[PDB]
Write a protein that binds this DNA or RNA. Structure first.
Ligand code: XG4
Ligand code: MG
Ligand code: MG
Length: 425
DNA sequence: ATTATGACGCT
């Protein structure tokens, strides 16, 4: 009892820009605001693959990974913005820069771990302590939490329910106890309302957030009430929340490992994991997964919020599916040169903005009819930011995959250059 | 013929 630690030491938030690329296009083109609209890559094949969808279009069934021509069947009024194309490929510069805007605002409040182009984790522990001392026992008003949902409440119209749950929670709060985890979460949620208001004031972008004691619960919480809302998942809400939560919904159990948990153990929901000893879990799933699962199904996770606002690698990738697969030497060279030219542009801007140089170049390729998503992956040294040198070295490092007797076989369905191993500059 | 990425683990 007294010695079972409960993983209530930290306050952690996950902030996700809602349908981010769509919002970027809607800020730039006001004729898209508050309409069903989606963002697409390419236009020739079935109107393009959709990678971002507004909530209005979602109301009609439009999803990511869907062809635009199919989305139009579900939503005939759908508006489409095209990703920029440079050197024959998609170019996401507009959104990486919009993302830097957002991250830079978030960093004013706390240390943030860039988790993706549009979402970060926040370690609010110190900020909550500072703010708690600032209040000096003063009670927390519902006015400070105008968009917060308390998961599990009310107990015993959507905004009406929300306010009821918030009132029940705030009435129960022990404000005089500067060490109660629930109070600390509440204060973190006040600070996240402030962060979200600053992001929207200074960018016009709206976002959702989850507030809890760890990254996995913050991420799960973030998803309970979207869009433009935030959800506080308290330690005490976990047993009910997890009692019907499909295992696949927890970050990192969405794939094969979550499938084998389901199949081997014979369960469906996260909470059912509590009925297995740690050793049993370790035995089925390895020592790391086992320890991690034994703690996670009790709402405990220790992965730290890593202080990292910049990506660790910088990458350029283009698929060549179907009959478009590259089949000659000239083709592989020209696309390696296109890939390297964009890579070089991104790298020079990275060196100048962020004072660092990449030292290693990873070349990945897929070949046609190869099952795997990397038919090959080989590294070479990255010594200068020269597109022609980088493309030439990538070719030198893959060329012994050609089996022709000027021709290229097996045909290539993917080229991919990645710059890694950054050293300060 | 979702694509374009990017973190992270295993060996
Ligand atoms: N090129 C590409 N971009 C992608 C892909 N997946 C996502 N993006 C881009 C487009 C997305 O806008 C952005 C962020 O991805 P999310 O946070 O997963 N989705 P969003 O912010 O759209 O909606 P929500 O309110 O549910 O969070 O990343 C992809 O497979 N390929
Ligand atoms: Mg998002
Ligand atoms: Mg995201």
């Amino acid at each position: 009892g007294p010695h079972m630690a409960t993983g209530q030491d930290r306050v952690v938030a996950l902030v996700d820009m809602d349908c981010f690329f769509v919002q970027v296009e809607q800020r730039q083109n006001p004729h898209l605001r508050n309409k069903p609209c989606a963002v697409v890559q390419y236009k020739s094949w079935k109107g393009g693959g959709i990678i971002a969808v507004s909530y209005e279009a979602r109301a009609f069934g439009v999803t990511r990974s869907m062809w635009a021509d199919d989305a139009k069947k579900l939503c005939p009024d759908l508006l489409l913005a095209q990703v920029r194309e440079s050197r024959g490929k998609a170019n996401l510069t507009k959104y990486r820069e919009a993302s830097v805007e957002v991250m830079e605002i978030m960093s004013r409040f706390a240390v943030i771990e860039r988790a993706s182009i549009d979402e970060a984790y926040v370690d609010l522990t110190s900020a909550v302590q500072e703010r708690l001392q600032k209040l000096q026992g003063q009670p927390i008003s519902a006015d400070l939490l105008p968009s917060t949902y308390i998961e599990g409440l009310p107990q015993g119209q959507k905004e009406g329910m929300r306010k009821q749950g918030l009132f029940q929670w705030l009435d129960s709060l022990q404000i005089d106890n500067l060490t109660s985890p629930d109070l600390q979460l509440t204060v973190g949620a006040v600070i996240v309302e402030e962060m979200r208001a600053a992001i929207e004031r200074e960018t016009g972008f709206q976002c959702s957030a989850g507030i809890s004691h760890n990254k996995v619960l913050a991420k799960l919480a973030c998803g309970l009430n979207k869009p433009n809302r935030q959800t506080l998942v308290s330690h005490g809400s976990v047993p009910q929340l997890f009692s019907q939560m499909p295992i696949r919904k927890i970050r990192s159990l969405g794939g094969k490992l979550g499938a084998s948990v389901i199949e081997i153990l014979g369960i469906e929901y996260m909470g059912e994991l509590t009925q297995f000893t740690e050793s049993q879990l370790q035995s089925h799933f390895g020592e790391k997964n086992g320890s991690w699962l034994y703690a996670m199904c009790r709402g405990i996770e220790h992965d730290p919020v890593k202080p990292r606002q910049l990506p660790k690698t910088i990458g350029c990738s283009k698929n060549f599916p179907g009959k478009t697969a590259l089949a000659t030497r000239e083709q592989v060279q020209w696309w390696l040169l296109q890939l390297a030219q964009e890579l070089e542009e991104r790298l020079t801007k990275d060196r100048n903005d962020n004072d660092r140089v990449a030292t290693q170049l990873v070349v990945s390729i897929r070949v046609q009819g190869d099952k795997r998503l990397s038919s090959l992956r080989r590294c070479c040294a990255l010594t200068r930011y020269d597109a022609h040198k980088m493309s030439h070295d990538a070719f030198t490092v893959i060329k012994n995959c050609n089996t022709s007797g000027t021709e290229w076989s097996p045909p290539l369905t993917m080229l991919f250059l990645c710059a890694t191993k950054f050293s300060a500059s």
